[PDB]
Design a protein that fits this description.
2 copies of one chain form a homodimer. Chain A is an alpha+beta fold. Chain A contains 9 helices and 13 strands. At the A-B interface, helix 1 and strand 10 of A face helix 1, strand 9 and strand 10 of B. The structure holds the ligand O=C1C[C@@H](C(=O)Nc2cccc(C3CC3)c2)c2cccnc2N1 (2 copies). Chain B: It comes from Severe acute respiratory syndrome coronavirus 2 (2019-nCoV).
Chain lengths: 305, 301
């Protein structure tokens, strides 16, 4: 029993984290095979950050301007290039701890584990969702840039996120490992703001299924609904539309618990309209939207890595 | 900024997890140097579970009755002994991935990371606290026994928990790595039940200090309180007593934020009275009690 916000075990990623230094800037890099990946903003100083010309800053650098430290060992940089907003430093040694991996771009609503790091040293791991407004609600201080997010699908690490910056609201923005931002953000010091966020409906439903599986059933009711009626309610409460694909994805949980997705939608309708009436669900007084259907099934079935 | 329930990176522990089998029972063990630690109940059968006599079950076993698998490899067991409620299996290979480590017994309110494991392979990592009633609110299925809890302050892993069982209420009980249970529990399937659980007051206060550090002040008020009046009110909401030690421990957070500990106590009293009136603190609509003072300073500043 029990249901917790759970991250993937982080060991396979821990063996890839290094420190990257350029001038007076130190941040984290990801060392896979013979390349170190890190945010291209490592090459900027204070003045540069206001309006950087990255190609022009980069052409001025030699390999020896980038100091890469893996533990207590310096790696030799033998090449450098940029891909979108990530810098790729070719080094003279392949990482002997390189896991089986891929680079994947995730969709809003999908979850991943973040390994927060400082000076190339992993400090903490936590689970995040990519918000509908393409931010993440992370926990990051000065020095965390280049921290990465990932999933593990089998023995294969899927890297999906590299941390680039904090927005003024205190939420976080970054890129895939091919250097494309999630969201309408740019890597420069200027006023930027996230869009208004919405709640991830399919995930709330997943978590309601988790609650039922763990014995917490007070919110169930005799009623059902239709997709269109439910979506009018979702829109009113700043919930993402529920699609037929979402309904299909929750199919397993529906069959296991005997509660059809649109029956559970009728539960969720009532919760939005009436609140929780002083009760909790899985120890929370708000509706949790950072577990996917896959997360719920995985944790309520004991899958291993 | 931001504030998350954060676990330690699990890699140092992952490299120590093995599978232990005895008869038809398989669970997890922790392989450090040349010893594998696991719950002694691995040697029980169905019959045994109400009133096992562990010394009598153990004397009947040989080394070769214990199968230990580390990844794809069998380890050879060359010795065994029991210490309290843990079995220690001496094996013929020291674990080359053994981290710097120590065994520490923790007190209620302390937090740690759990690496949940099945068949000797890591499933997930999450953060837990030792509740005042000596249970933890974990996430554990059949096969999770022998999963461990730990902290990593610096490069040294401090092992503080090994998982043994789930109580009827769905909460979890286990031992330190010297095999002494937390709380009044025993490794038997007799009816046992945890004490009423209470809120960890010192941690709630820590987390209110975290909210102030992250720029949120809405819940403060102009009042203070004596320690004794605070405790008289807080007990009525099932909050643990706050002690002078706890007040001392909050001193650094007090000094960082400019808010005296007993003024923060006054804020908490009002929150218990009023609720949150549709607001949140660090993203929660309930008061959070699974961050320690030490955790707050580590994650914020
Ligand atoms: O998440 C973080 C990392 C880091 C940060 O946000 N840097 C940062 C901010 C704006 C723009 C840029 C770059 C693209 C041009 C980088 C930080 C420094 C100090 C305090 N908190 C944090 N939080
Ligand atoms: O945490 C867990 C592990 C495991 C469990 O609780 N085993 C267990 C229960 C009572 C007593 C004993 C031993 C000392 C005599 C062991 C379990 C089995 C089935 C369903 N859920 C779980 N949850």
């Amino acid at each position: 029993s029990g249901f917790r916000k759970m991250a993937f075990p982080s060991g396979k990623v821990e063996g890839c984290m290094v420190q990257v230094t350029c001038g007076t800037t130190t941040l984290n890099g990801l060392w896979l095979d013979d390349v170190v990946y890190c945010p291209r903003h490592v090459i900027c100083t204070s003045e540069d950050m206001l309006n950087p010309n990255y190609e022009d800053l980069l052409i001025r650098k030699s390999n020896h301007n980038f100091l890469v430290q893996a533990g207590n060992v310096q790696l030799r940089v033998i090449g450098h290039s940029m891909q979108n907003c990530v810098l790729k430093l070719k080094v003279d040694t392949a990482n002997p701890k390189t896991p089986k991996y891929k680079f994947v771009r995730i969709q809003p609503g999908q979850t991943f584990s973040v390994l927060a790091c400082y000076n190339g040293s992993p400090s903490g791991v936590y689970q995040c969702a990519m918000r509908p407004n393409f931010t993440i609600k992370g926990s990051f201080l000065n020095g965390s840039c280049g921290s990465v997010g990932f999933n593990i699908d089998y023995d294969c690490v899927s890297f999906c996120y590299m941390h680039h910056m904090e927005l003024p609201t205190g939420v976080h923005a970054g890129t895939d490992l091919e250097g494309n931002f999630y969201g309408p953000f740019v890597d420069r010091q200027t006023a930027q703001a996230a869009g208004t966020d919405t709640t991830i409906t399919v995930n709330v439903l997943a978590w309601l299924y988790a609650a039922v599986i763990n014995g917490d059933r007070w919110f169930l009711n005799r009623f059902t609904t239709t997709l269109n009626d439910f979506n009018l309610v979702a829109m009113k409460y700043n919930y993402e539309p529920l699609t037929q694909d979402h309904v299909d994805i929750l199919g397993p949980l529906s069959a296991q618990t005997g509660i059809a997705v649109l029956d559970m939608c009728a539960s969720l309708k009532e919760l939005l309209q009436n609140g929780m009436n002083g009760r909790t669900i899985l120890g929370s007084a708000l509706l949790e939207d950072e577990f996917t259907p896959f997360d719920v099934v995985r944790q309520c079935s004991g899958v291993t890595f």
